[PDB]
């Protein structure tokens, strides 16, 4: 489905191009295979992102990476890519609105669940390769608020910073007040506890 869409759009196949044209156009890779080239990489990425966020041809776990400096667009669709959900930011504003929270609050007897957030295009998964091209906000209330403009092009926002921890590190209370090795020791001890 990824390749069919690219062919439909203005992606010139490798066979049907002259090598002189590879200079200006951005290479398109799908699962590591060089499919073709594109002249409008910015519009292609916008279209690819829009389709993925709509649960269109591109599925949620498909990761599109653009190397602007290297003039390469890499699309990955295979297994084993580790990704995490992040809130989408547009114009320094979360796409997650109060209406989404209200629907979530009545999670039961309403059929609204996490998938509707992904379907709504408010939260998307970002793999480690795609995270390199992402400008990430730790919190919405401190990072993308009107202030000294350290950065005004945030593309994503962490749902909560504490999600970087695992199961065993998530039971440590105030782990940010501890010296880090002692948080590692507890993760080992917490597995040997009794209960």
């Amino acid at each position: 489905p990824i390749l069919e869409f690219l062919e439909e759009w203005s992606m010139e196949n490798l066979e049907e191009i002259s090598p002189a044209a590879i200079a200006d156009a951005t290479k398109i890779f799908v699962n590591g295979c060089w499919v073709g080239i594109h002249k409008d990489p910015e519009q292609l990425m916008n279209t690819l992102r829009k389709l993925r966020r709509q649960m269109d041809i591109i599925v949620s776990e498909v990761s599109m990476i653009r190397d602007i400096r290297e003039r390469e667009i890499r699309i990955y669709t295979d297994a084993g890519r580790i990704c995490r959900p992040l809130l989408i930011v547009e114009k320094q504003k979360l796409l997650l609105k109060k209406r989404h929270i209200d629907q979530l609050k009545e999670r039961e007897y309403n059929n609204y669940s996490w998938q509707d957030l992904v379907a709504s295009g408010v939260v998307e998964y970002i793999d480690t390769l795609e995270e390199e091209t992402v400008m990430l906000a730790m919190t919405p209330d401190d990072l993308q608020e009107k202030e000294v403009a350290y950065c005004s092009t945030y593309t994503h926002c962490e749902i909560h910073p504490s999600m970087i921890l695992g199961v065993c590190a998530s039971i440590i209370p105030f782990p940010d007040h501890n010296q880090s090795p002692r948080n590692t020791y507890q993760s080992a001890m917490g597995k040997q506890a009794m209960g």
Binding site: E42, I68, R71, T133, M135, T153
Partner: protein
């Protein structure tokens, strides 16, 4: 510096000298083909290679959301106040701290270094 290819078999042309006329000739191999050289320089290497990074910089970098943007360095070509600045951060320099600027205005990929 220029690299020339044979017009017959599209192979590399290598420098050659004709003792009859004493003029540099780029002669094809395995092609008994010769051409009149004009550059007169067959090889040149710059150890320092102070290559202007502006040539290597690409205007599309202005679309990178992870680059800082400054209003204090307006673009000279079009006067746009916003610009995207960054370091070369590439090997072979040994001192990569100077900032290269790219105009953020679309259709003006002007690149400059302060």
């Amino acid at each position: 510096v220029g690299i020339r290819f044979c017009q017959e078999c599209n192979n590399m042309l290598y420098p050659k000298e004709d003792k009859e006329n004493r003029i540099l000739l780029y002669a094809c191999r395995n092609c008994d083909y010769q051409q009149e050289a004009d550059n007169s320089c067959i090889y040149v290497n710059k150890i320092t290679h102070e290559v202007d990074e502006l040539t290597q910089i690409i205007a599309d970098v202005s679309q990178d959301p992870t680059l800082p943007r400054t209003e204090d360095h307006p673009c000279q070509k079009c006067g746009h106040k916003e610009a995207v600045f960054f370091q070369s951060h590439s090997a072979r320099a040994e001192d990569a701290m100077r900032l290269y600027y790219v105009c953020t205005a679309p259709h003006c990929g002007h690149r400059w270094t302060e």
